[PDB]
Symmetry: C2
């Protein structure tokens, strides 16, 4: 007991670490009421068991009590100061003692629960490296293999431990080793179902894992246990498929591509049947049918499986008769000739060759990542995404270089302005367009950037728990794609209406990363939030217009805007950014203004969507109700606390202040304040189509005050 | 009659439906044909694609692939949705009717249909035909050999195993044409048979049949070696592999049933003549009344797997 030289207690730790188990012939044969009472009280306070266990303890003498106390202390010290990877699984060694079982027990399982809870509390915050994941995977595998013990209470306590472990660590559901082990053990049990019970040797060996399984004698018990086990598989499979269908679906596809099981597939092979049956009734909708108001899709699964097997066989054939040069030449020829079929064939052949090798071969990976950039479209991007998913699912220990190469490719695409980051093109105004250059819409088209962000979001969701270095990659990628230069024509992103989807999707991803509470430092978040606010404000510095796309590709834009508004409204995590009050209010004002502007824009877009009421068409109700409530709240502002808003907008950027009255506000103070500000300093604005009318008429008919009027520098306007 | 089921008029489609019902009633064998299913899947995919195609844009006509015809569609979205939903039921009805009687042939045809390169590119999209094909297979499936006769389970592993083996070996054999060649395959098969290795035997058999299925000539020596293969490795595993290869060969190539049947009949007669199985000789055992010698009695039952 802690509490006398310190080294006296310190020496006990290593002794307990190297001490053997207190194992053992009858148990009793081997081995002052006040002291007994106080010892019982201390033990019952240390354990705190259910009352039946306390009643069982109440009839024990001193020797059993001190034995229990000694074993509890020894096991606690061992688990606290151990370093072996078998820390908590040694306790089952006490559960297999026949002498302990024959004795006239629940104390053992109580102390086992206590030590398991202590171990879980310790592991809850150990680290975020690969070794911890490996240890957790091994412990989960051990608990799974101990679920089918021949005894009664052993399987119950194993089930309880497994439930607790999977409760506190949800990320183990979509692991790539648990599913294979559970399918293998299920197949082993199914094979053992009918194996001539009278014949001896009921033991079995689990493939790819050193363990053994014992089975009962009667057929009824075996059928009961296999039927009982056949439910946890479905439960955890549906739980895993509920959250992250992509990764588990890819793992299931990978599992169905082994040569050993193909020979026996003509037989029952219950594992394959379970795998191919559990995929369907937990599937979801595809991109086309994801947002509609009142179908199921499985073609992607079969297409991916067939392509994978076909190209794996085609590339495995080549080794029979260096070779990377031919593949590179074929890819370059396909890119130069611009042939889609040859492009896809070369890409799949290259990735299939890469997945079956012993070296990274950096040139192959570099050519793999730089491929689609020369054939920017949707088909090539889909092929690239499929190849990337196969590469990630097949080989291990390759995530970091692939992520670095992808980040480099993304930064190169940003720098070259090949997509959403392209330049802006102007068109002739119709008032003076009598020339042969008739006006016409010129909207930028960004198809693949709408899918690349989705892939990034999926990868971030996958890698939020396990890894700790990919977060830095994502942070750098987000930081290098934004800039705080809200103004005339320098924002690093296009400002057209048809390019609002990816912008707000990336903003939402950045906000989600900020809310994940991963960055420990208190200064990175400040800069990131400042940049987020700047790039959010930058969009409202242009005259309003109307969308040009069709009826489709518009509903999901409104959904994304509503989701971003909801995320923005739930950003009250301030007062810990370290004079904190100054920064607090500095953020609060901008948050309120951004919310008001977003509400107005969303209302305008939804009004433009359908002219009539159209009760058949409907969107999320909570977002609409919140927007209506906010509009009602902000529509009641008086003359004050609104001119200060104009002053704040002018402090942010003069262009935003000039464009503010365009977003109609049913109040005349805005115009007067804007006129006063522009009269105080006319040189800050040079955009003629709107800003001239705030200065030209010093007075409408009064015709006084001929000073400070210098209109000999404004750009030409309409006739 | 199938392509005339979706006419723009009212009575035309009714009379076409009546004629189709009568024709399929008097000729049941058309259900498991290998061309009706592909055509109906193609027209269903065409209608699904035409579901959302900018109704205001002109040219409502469409062309059915692999069959010279055309389809017209109504103007309003509601009529198009109604007609496609109406058509989406006959497919399931006839699919379940076909799978009820002869599951093997229709299952093999469905497996063959899912192995085309053109649809794989668009499989990342909806491609309603593939979704229908992969959805209609399950709830009309049956029990396997182990669980066919019991008194009070479902099996799908055979489907995936066959599909994976077929695609893998098709790709592996298609690779070889890039760089005659039948001699190597025959030598490999003979070496595998002499060494008595099951994995090599299966690999050689699948490679040989995949090479044969993609050619322009019968090549009788290849077929003869294909039919005489299992007789040198009489067992259940080799027989299962041979049955799978025979099913793939029958499902893949056309106009080959007669020579294959003749070769199989010849192999069966040879097996009968050589007394390798059920037609073997009879073995007697000593009676226990006077079996005091060292030749103790013991059962000697023939085994015919």
């Amino acid at each position: 007991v802690e509490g006398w030289p310190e080294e006296w207690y310190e020496g006990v730790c290593e002794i307990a670490t190297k001490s053997p188990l207190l194992t053992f012939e009858p148990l009793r044969s081997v081995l002052t009421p006040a002291e007994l009472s106080e010892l019982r009280s201390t033990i019952i306070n240390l354990l705190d068991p259910p009352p039946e266990v306390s009643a069982l303890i109440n009839k024990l003498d001193f020797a059993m009590s001190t034995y229990l106390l000694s074993v509890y202390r020894l096991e606690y010290m061992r688990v606290l100061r151990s370093t072996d990877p078998d820390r908590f699984q040694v306790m089952f060694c006490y559960f297999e003692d026949k002498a302990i079982q024959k004795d006239k027990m629940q104390c053992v399982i109580a102390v086992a629960d206590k030590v398991f809870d202590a171990f879980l509390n310790m592991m809850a915050d150990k680290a975020k490296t690969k070794e911890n994941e490996e240890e957790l995977e091994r412990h989960a595998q051990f608990l799974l293999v101990n679920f089918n013990h021949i005894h009664k209470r052993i399987r119950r306590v194993a089930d309880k431990y497994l439930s607790g472990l999977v409760d506190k660590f949800p990320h183990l559901l979509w692991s790539g080793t648990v599913l294979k082990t559970m399918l293998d053990i299920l197949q082993t049990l199914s094979l053992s179902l009918s194996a001539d019970i009278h014949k001896d040797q009921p033991y079995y060996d689990i493939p790819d894992a050193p363990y053994r399984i014992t089975v009962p004698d009667t057929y009824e018990a075996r059928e009961s246990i296999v039927k009982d086990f056949a439910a946890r598989c479905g439960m955890i499979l549906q739980e895993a498929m509920k959250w992250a269908p992509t990764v588990t679906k890819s793992h299931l596809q990978e599992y169905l591509n082994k040569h050993q099981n193909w020979v026996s597939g003509l037989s029952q092979h219950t594992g394959l049947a379970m795998a191919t049956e559990s995929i369907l009734h937990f599937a979801g909708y595809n991109k086309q049918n994801t947002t509609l108001g009142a179908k199921k899709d499985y073609s992607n699964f079969m297409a991916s499986l067939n392509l994978r097997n076909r190209y794996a066989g085609e590339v495995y054939g080549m080794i029979r008769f260096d070779l990377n040069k031919m593949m590179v030449q074929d890819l370059h020829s396909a890119l130069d000739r611009s042939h889609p079929q040859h492009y896809t064939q070369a890409m799949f052949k290259l990735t299939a060759m890469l997945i079956s090798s012993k070296d990274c071969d950096p040139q192959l990976l570099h050519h793999l990542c730089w491929g689609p950039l020369r054939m920017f479209n949707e088909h090539g991007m889909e092929t690239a995404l499929a190849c990337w998913e196969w590469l990630l699912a097949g080989k291990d220990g390759v995530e970091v270089p692939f992520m670095r190469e992808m980040a480099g490719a993304w930064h190169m695409t940003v720098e070259q302005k090949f997509g959403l980051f392209s330049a802006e093109i102007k068109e002739a105004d119709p008032l003076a367009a009598s020339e042969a250059s008739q006006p016409k819409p010129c909207p930028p088209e960004v198809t693949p950037h709408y899918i690349w962000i989705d892939f990034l979001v999926q990868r971030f969701e996958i890698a939020k728990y396990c890894s700790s270095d990919q977060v830095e990659i994502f942070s750098s990628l987000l930081q290098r794609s934004m800039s705080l230069n809200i103004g005339g024509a320098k924002g690093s992103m296009n400002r057209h209406v048809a390019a609002i989807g990816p912008r707000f999707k990336l903003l939402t991803l950045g906000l989600s990363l900020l809310h994940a509470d991963v960055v420990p430092n208190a200064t990175i978040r400040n800069v990131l939030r400042e940049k987020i606010y700047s790039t959010a404000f930058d969009y409202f510095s242009c005259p309003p217009k109307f969308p040009t796309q069709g009826e489709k590709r518009l509903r999901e834009d409104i959904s994304i805007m509503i989701k971003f508004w909801t995320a923005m409204f739930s950003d009250k995590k301030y007062l810990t950014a370290s004079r904190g009050s100054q920064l607090h209010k500095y953020y609060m004002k901008r948050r309120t203004l951004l919310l008001s502007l977003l509400a107005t824009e969303i209302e305008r877009l939804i009004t433009w969507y359908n002219p009539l009421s159209a009760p058949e068409l409907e969107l999320d109700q909570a977002g609409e109700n919140s927007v209506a409530n906010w509009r009602s709240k902000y529509i009641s502002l008086s003359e004050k606390q609104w001119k200060d808003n104009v002053n704040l907008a002018w402090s942010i950027s003069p262009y935003l202040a000039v464009q503010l009255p365009a977003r109609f506000k049913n109040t005349e103070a805005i115009g007067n304040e804007v006129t006063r500000l522009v009269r105080l300093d006319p040189g800050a604005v040079s955009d003629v189509p709107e800003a001239i009318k705030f200065l030209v008429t010093w007075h409408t008919i009064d015709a006084d005050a001929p000073e400070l009027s210098h209109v000999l520098c404004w750009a030409p306007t309409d006739p």
